[PDB]
Design a protein around this motif. Structure first.
Motif, PDB file in Angstrom:
ATOM      1  N   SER A  17     -10.725  14.248  -4.921  1.00  0.00           N
ATOM      2  CA  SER A  17     -10.628  13.603  -3.607  1.00  0.00           C
ATOM      3  C   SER A  17     -10.998  12.134  -3.698  1.00  0.00           C
ATOM      4  N   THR A  18     -12.060  11.843  -4.437  1.00  0.00           N
ATOM      5  CA  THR A  18     -12.524  10.470  -4.607  1.00  0.00           C
ATOM      6  C   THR A  18     -11.489   9.619  -5.350  1.00  0.00           C
ATOM      7  N   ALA A  19     -10.909  10.181  -6.407  1.00  0.00           N
ATOM      8  CA  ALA A  19      -9.896   9.484  -7.194  1.00  0.00           C
ATOM      9  C   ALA A  19      -8.637   9.257  -6.354  1.00  0.00           C
ATOM     10  N   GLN A  20      -8.204  10.302  -5.653  1.00  0.00           N
ATOM     11  CA  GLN A  20      -7.016  10.228  -4.810  1.00  0.00           C
ATOM     12  C   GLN A  20      -7.156   9.182  -3.707  1.00  0.00           C
ATOM     13  N   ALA A  21      -8.321   9.141  -3.063  1.00  0.00           N
ATOM     14  CA  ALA A  21      -8.566   8.191  -1.983  1.00  0.00           C
ATOM     15  C   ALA A  21      -8.409   6.749  -2.461  1.00  0.00           C
ATOM     16  N   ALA A  22      -8.899   6.463  -3.662  1.00  0.00           N
ATOM     17  CA  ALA A  22      -8.796   5.124  -4.218  1.00  0.00           C
ATOM     18  C   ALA A  22      -7.339   4.800  -4.538  1.00  0.00           C
ATOM     19  N   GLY A  23      -6.647   5.752  -5.158  1.00  0.00           N
ATOM     20  CA  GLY A  23      -5.252   5.555  -5.513  1.00  0.00           C
ATOM     21  C   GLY A  23      -4.355   5.401  -4.301  1.00  0.00           C
ATOM     22  N   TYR A  24      -4.576   6.239  -3.292  1.00  0.00           N
ATOM     23  CA  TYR A  24      -3.784   6.176  -2.075  1.00  0.00           C
ATOM     24  C   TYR A  24      -3.982   4.848  -1.342  1.00  0.00           C
ATOM     25  N   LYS A  25      -5.217   4.347  -1.321  1.00  0.00           N
ATOM     26  CA  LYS A  25      -5.511   3.079  -0.653  1.00  0.00           C
ATOM     27  C   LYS A  25      -4.750   1.927  -1.312  1.00  0.00           C
ATOM     28  N   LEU A  26      -4.722   1.907  -2.644  1.00  0.00           N
ATOM     29  CA  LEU A  26      -4.004   0.861  -3.364  1.00  0.00           C
ATOM     30  C   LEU A  26      -2.518   0.955  -3.062  1.00  0.00           C
ATOM     31  N   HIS A  27      -2.009   2.186  -3.032  1.00  0.00           N
ATOM     32  CA  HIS A  27      -0.604   2.441  -2.740  1.00  0.00           C
ATOM     33  C   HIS A  27      -0.225   1.899  -1.361  1.00  0.00           C
ATOM     34  N   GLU A  28      -1.069   2.163  -0.364  1.00  0.00           N
ATOM     35  CA  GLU A  28      -0.816   1.702   1.002  1.00  0.00           C
ATOM     36  C   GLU A  28      -0.851   0.189   1.132  1.00  0.00           C
ATOM     37  N   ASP A  29      -1.720  -0.446   0.354  1.00  0.00           N
ATOM     38  CA  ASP A  29      -1.842  -1.895   0.384  1.00  0.00           C
ATOM     39  C   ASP A  29      -0.844  -2.563  -0.556  1.00  0.00           C
ATOM     40  N   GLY A  30      -0.041  -1.753  -1.242  1.00  0.00           N
ATOM     41  CA  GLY A  30       0.952  -2.277  -2.163  1.00  0.00           C
ATOM     42  C   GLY A  30       0.365  -3.027  -3.343  1.00  0.00           C
ATOM     43  N   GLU A  31      -0.748  -2.532  -3.869  1.00  0.00           N
ATOM     44  CA  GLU A  31      -1.402  -3.161  -5.008  1.00  0.00           C
ATOM     45  C   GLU A  31      -1.510  -2.185  -6.180  1.00  0.00           C
ATOM     46  N   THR A  32      -1.606  -2.726  -7.390  1.00  0.00           N
ATOM     47  CA  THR A  32      -1.735  -1.906  -8.590  1.00  0.00           C
ATOM     48  C   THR A  32      -2.800  -2.482  -9.512  1.00  0.00           C
ATOM     49  N   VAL A  33      -3.322  -1.635 -10.394  1.00  0.00           N
ATOM     50  CA  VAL A  33      -4.337  -2.044 -11.359  1.00  0.00           C
ATOM     51  C   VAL A  33      -3.980  -1.492 -12.737  1.00  0.00           C
ATOM     52  N   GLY A  34      -4.412  -2.196 -13.781  1.00  0.00           N
ATOM     53  CA  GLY A  34      -4.129  -1.761 -15.137  1.00  0.00           C
ATOM     54  C   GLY A  34      -2.792  -2.250 -15.659  1.00  0.00           C
ATOM     55  N   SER A  35      -2.672  -2.338 -16.979  1.00  0.00           N
ATOM     56  CA  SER A  35      -1.441  -2.805 -17.608  1.00  0.00           C
ATOM     57  C   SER A  35      -0.265  -1.865 -17.353  1.00  0.00           C
ATOM     58  N   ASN A  36      -0.563  -0.598 -17.073  1.00  0.00           N
ATOM     59  CA  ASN A  36       0.469   0.397 -16.795  1.00  0.00           C
ATOM     60  C   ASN A  36       0.784   0.481 -15.298  1.00  0.00           C
ATOM     61  N   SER A  37       0.166  -0.408 -14.522  1.00  0.00           N
ATOM     62  CA  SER A  37       0.377  -0.509 -13.075  1.00  0.00           C
ATOM     63  C   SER A  37       0.209   0.761 -12.242  1.00  0.00           C
ATOM     64  N   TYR A  38      -1.032   1.209 -12.105  1.00  0.00           N
ATOM     65  CA  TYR A  38      -1.335   2.391 -11.310  1.00  0.00           C
ATOM     66  C   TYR A  38      -1.817   1.945  -9.930  1.00  0.00           C
ATOM     67  N   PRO A  39      -1.460   2.698  -8.875  1.00  0.00           N
ATOM     68  CA  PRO A  39      -0.642   3.913  -8.947  1.00  0.00           C
ATOM     69  C   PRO A  39       0.858   3.626  -8.971  1.00  0.00           C
ATOM     70  N   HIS A  40       1.630   4.527  -9.573  1.00  0.00           N
ATOM     71  CA  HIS A  40       3.079   4.350  -9.593  1.00  0.00           C
ATOM     72  C   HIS A  40       3.786   5.685  -9.425  1.00  0.00           C
ATOM     73  N   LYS A  41       5.063   5.630  -9.072  1.00  0.00           N
ATOM     74  CA  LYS A  41       5.829   6.840  -8.844  1.00  0.00           C
ATOM     75  C   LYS A  41       5.828   7.796 -10.020  1.00  0.00           C
ATOM     76  N   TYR A  42       5.695   9.072  -9.695  1.00  0.00           N
ATOM     77  CA  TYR A  42       5.710  10.133 -10.680  1.00  0.00           C
ATOM     78  C   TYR A  42       7.026  10.862 -10.403  1.00  0.00           C
ATOM     79  N   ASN A  43       7.918  10.857 -11.389  1.00  0.00           N
ATOM     80  CA  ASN A  43       9.248  11.455 -11.255  1.00  0.00           C
ATOM     81  C   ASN A  43       9.375  12.956 -11.423  1.00  0.00           C
ATOM     82  N   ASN A  44       8.330  13.580 -11.946  1.00  0.00           N
ATOM     83  CA  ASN A  44       8.314  15.018 -12.186  1.00  0.00           C
ATOM     84  C   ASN A  44       9.404  15.466 -13.168  1.00  0.00           C
ATOM     85  N   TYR A  45       9.506  14.749 -14.286  1.00  0.00           N
ATOM     86  CA  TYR A  45      10.470  15.081 -15.334  1.00  0.00           C
ATOM     87  C   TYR A  45      10.155  16.478 -15.872  1.00  0.00           C
TER      88      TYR A  45
END
Ligand SMILES: Nc1nc2c(ncn2[C@@H]2O[C@H](CO)[C@@H](O)[C@H]2OP(=O)(O)O)c(=O)[nH]1
Ligand SMILES: [Ca+2]
Ligand SMILES: [Ca+2]
Length: 104
Positions: A17-45
């Motif tokens: 829940s704690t991890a998700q809340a942080a990730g969701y907040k960044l997503h809503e604000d349209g911001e990313t962190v890290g060289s791999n740019s998280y959070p980002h779309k997961y395609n479910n390959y």
């Protein structure tokens, strides 16, 4: 006991829940962190049977209990959707290359 086990990592629902809340907040604000740019779309390959609707986004969950802020993402991920619903917890641990397997 662990609510989610990713390889050797033990997570409680509060960890997720704690991890998700942080990730969701960044997503809503349209911001990313890290060289791999998280959070980002997961395609479910992988074709996991998610019970909630897409789109899905992946965000690193750390075994230290700390919230991801830009360093090494590790192997574990929390997957959430557009409605802030948890789709699942997955990991590269025990999977070939960059594939994912579900945490138990
Ligand atoms: N394995 C996997 N990678 C995905 C998926 N959706 C997006 N990706 C990205 O596709 C590339 C190959 O796996 C990587 O950049 C990976 O991102 P992450 O490495 O950040 O997870 C998915 O459904 N499965
Ligand atoms: Ca914990
Ligand atoms: Ca700490």
């Amino acid at each position: 006991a662990c609510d989610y086990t990713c390889g050797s990592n033990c997570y409680s629902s509060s960890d997720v829940s704690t991890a998700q809340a942080a990730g969701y907040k960044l997503h809503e604000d349209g911001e990313t962190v890290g060289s791999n740019s998280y959070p980002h779309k997961y395609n479910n390959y992988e074709g996991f049977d998610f019970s909630v609707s897409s789109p899905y986004y992946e965000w690193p969950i750390l075994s230290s209990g700390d919230v991801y802020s830009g360093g090494s993402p590790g192997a574990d991920r929390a997957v959430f959707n557009e409605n802030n619903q948890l789709a699942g917890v997955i990991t590269h641990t025990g999977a070939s290359g960059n594939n994912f397997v579900e945490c138990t």
